[PDB]
Every structure is written in C-alpha cells, then in structure tokens.
Design a protein around this ligand. Structure first.
Ligand SMILES: Cc1c2c(c(O)c3c(O)cccc13)C(=O)[C@]1(O)C(=O)C(C(N)=O)=C(O)C[C@@H]1C2
Ligand SMILES: Cc1c2c(c(O)c3c(O)cccc13)C(=O)[C@]1(O)C(=O)C(C(N)=O)=C(O)C[C@@H]1C2
Ligand SMILES: [Mg+2]
Ligand SMILES: [Mg+2]
Lengths: 197, 200
C-alpha cells in the first residue's frame, strides 16, 4: 500500500497490456484503491514510468561498472549488451526508458562511468557522446525488434539481395546485427581517439 | 474517398492527437464516413501506421539513392540525415516508423541500396548491418529527442555530482543534433576500419 508495491503491480501490468495500456486508472483498479491514493507514492504516469525504468535496470542490467584492468572498449560493449538484455526483459521496456534522465539512485554509477571515460583519454564531451551513441543505438535496435514482433500479430518471389537480407534478419532476434553495429561504434570511437592524439 | 484524402487527414490527425490518440474510429469521424467505408481503405491502426510510415518517407525523405560517383560513406551519412528529417516532420514520426518493414513499393530502392553497398566491397550481410545500424541509431536519437522534450513540465538537483551535472549541461545545450552527428560519424568510421580490416 506504498511506493514499492505500486512498482511491482505496474511491472505486471506493463507485461500484460504494454506501455499504452498502463494507465493511472488501470493500475489503481489492479491495486484496488482510489486514483489519488496512488498519487502519494507514484505521482503520475511519467513518474511511474521513470520509476519502472530504474527498477528494470536495477533488477536486470547486471553490468554497469568496469572491472579492474578493463578496456573502455570492453566496458562499452558489456554495458550496451547488458542494457539491451534488460530492455528486452519487459514488454515495451525500451519505450519505458525513452526520455528518462539519470535518477538519484544511479548518480554514483553514472559518474563513475563518465570518470572512467575521461581517465581513458576521452574528453567529458566525447566520452559522453560515445555513451549516448551506444545508448541510442541500443534503444532503437530494441524498439525496432520489440515493435516488429508485436506487429506480426496484425500484418500478413523477391529480389535476391533483399530476400537474402530478410533471411539474415529473421535468423535471430536482431542480436548479430546489434553486435555488428556496436563494434562499429567502438571501432569508430577508437579511430577518433587516436586521431586526436 | 481515395488514398491521398485518407493519408492527408491521417497525418493531420497525427499532429492533432499523437500516435497514442490516433485511432481508425477518429479518422472515420474526421473523414465523415462510416466505419466500414474506411475499413476497406485502412483495416486497423497497424495498417494505418504502416501506410503513414511509408507516406512520410515518400514525401519527406528527400534522399535515398547515391549520385554517380558518391562514396558509400556519404551515402550512409545522407540517408541517415534525410531519414531523421522525415521523422522530425510529423508528431511521433519516429514512433510511427517503428516495427515496420520495407513496402513492396520501396523494394526497388532497397535492392539498389543493398547492391550499391555490395558494389563497394561490403558483403551483403555487412552492408545490411551497416544500414540497419545507421537506421537504428537514428531512430533512437530522434526518439530520445522527441521524448525528453515531451516530458519537460512533468530545478536541477543540488546533489548532482560534477561530471553528471556538466554532462546534462552538455546535452541540453542543443536539440540533440551535435550528439547525433558525432554518433553517425563514429558508425561510419567503424564501418571503414572493418571494411579495410577485411579488404586487406
Ligand atoms: C552515462 C549515462 C548513461 C545514461 C544517461 O542517460 C546519461 C545521461 O542522460 C547523461 C550523461 C550520461 C549518461 C543512461 O541512460 C544509462 O542507460 C544508465 O543510466 C545506465 C545505468 N543506470 O546503469 C547505464 O549503465 C548506461 C547509461 C549511462
Ligand atoms: C534495407 C532496409 C531499410 C529499412 C528497413 O527497415 C529494413 C528492414 O526493416 C529490414 C531489412 C532491410 C531494411 C529502413 O527502414 C530504411 O530507412 C528505408 O526503408 C529506406 C527507404 N525507404 O528509403 C532507406 O533509405 C534506408 C532503410 C533501408
Ligand atoms: Mg538513458
Ligand atoms: Mg525501418
């Protein structure tokens, strides 16, 4: 009857109806309380969504900080893949994350990641841009995957390249395509960092 | 009614009520026709969104094919920039695009795009993965842009640590375009290194 139990109902509802159907009204029903009483703990849908994003990563993003000795390349790769896996746990998990900014509970992690970059030859700006590029790529890759599978519920002799392309994409959940683009980002950051020197 | 009529009012309604608010019931109302009349044009919201996605690129994605003698680098950069502009045109445009596949009317262009990549020494697979990476990154950047601004009215926390404070300062300084162009160019430089790694 608090803030934490809103969150655990709201995760269940999200999986059931998705982000669109996750309303203040519907969550109150599922909890069996009035709408203003959810407010004491989860103000509105934005605050609720913000809380859900944080909880999803807290539970299911099991890599955030570099290990002793770890390259920034490896740090970026593991962070991106872990974030992807976490977004994929819940339905519309990536939609939930869109437009959120770091929460008070994540500040020390995020700061350590930013510091790490600056310690590995990046300017704060460039270290940040690299991280945001990895985050944006992961968000779009997952949101495309998540939405395409959803859309097959409703949607019903090809050119040789496109036919081959489609077979390649349908081979898995997008993972190999993801890992390729992720490495390309990393390889590009490396070139840029070497360039500057 | 006919196709352009349905499409023009759908796009207008998208700007009015956004993707969540958009319903075939409200489009029929707006068009002044009964439900089954529209049904035979758009069977549901998923069909409507598909039709909108295609139309938005048809009208506002001004670049798709490379000029004679244009580099693959430039081709990728130009497709992304143009894709982003088309997505920025209408409310929730990046959300409308999500999940779709190329339409039969886009097949000829896509095949030409894939072949061009193979003509520059990409395997079909790696050319595909390059194009998808640029698309995905562009969607995510745009969606993050369209969504953070959206939630603006829903004071900077005094407990913000310094790199994070400054980082958030850096991000707000513009509409996301600087970060987007840096990310796009990182992708392109990485494709280059990879293509060179193999083609050596
Ligand atoms: C480093 C940084 C990240 C994120 C940001 O939003 C940032 C931002 O808005 C400004 C400056 C830096 C940011 C994330 O959203 C992120 O997904 C995140 O929060 C967590 C995490 N909580 O573990 C990550 O591990 C990766 C990402 C790091
Ligand atoms: C090659 C390919 C593209 C796209 C896809 O969605 C694909 C997909 O979902 C599966 C397999 C291949 C895809 C696009 O969305 C894209 O933005 C597009 O359609 C157009 C375009 N219409 O001009 C492009 O110019 C580039 C992109 C090509
Ligand atoms: Mg984020
Ligand atoms: Mg697409």
């Amino acid at each position: 009857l608090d803030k934490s139990k809103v969150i655990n109902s709201a995760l269940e509802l999200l999986n059931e109806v998705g982000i669109e159907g996750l309303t203040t009204r519907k969550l109150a029903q599922k909890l069996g309380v009035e709408q203003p009483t959810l407010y004491w703990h989860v103000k509105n849908k934005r605050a609720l969504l913000d809380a859900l994003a944080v909880e999803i990563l807290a539970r299911h993003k099991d890599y955030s900080l570099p290990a002793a000795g770890e390259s920034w390349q490896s740090f970026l790769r593991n962070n991106a893949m872990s974030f992807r896996r976490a977004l994929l746990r819940y339905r519309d998990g990536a939609k939930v994350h869109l437009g959120t900014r770091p929460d008070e509970k994540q500040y020390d992690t995020v700061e350590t990641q930013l510091r790490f970059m600056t310690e590995n030859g990046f300017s704060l700006r460039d270290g940040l841009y690299a991280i945001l590029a990895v985050i944006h790529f992961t968000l779009g890759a997952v949101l495309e995957q998540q939405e395409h599978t959803a859309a097959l519920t409703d949607r019903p002799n090809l050119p040789p390249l496109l036919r081959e392309a489609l077979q390649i994409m349908d081979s898995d959940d997008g993972e190999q395509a993801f890992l390729h683009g992720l490495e390309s980002l990393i390889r590009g950051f490396e070139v840029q960092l070497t360039a500057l020197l």
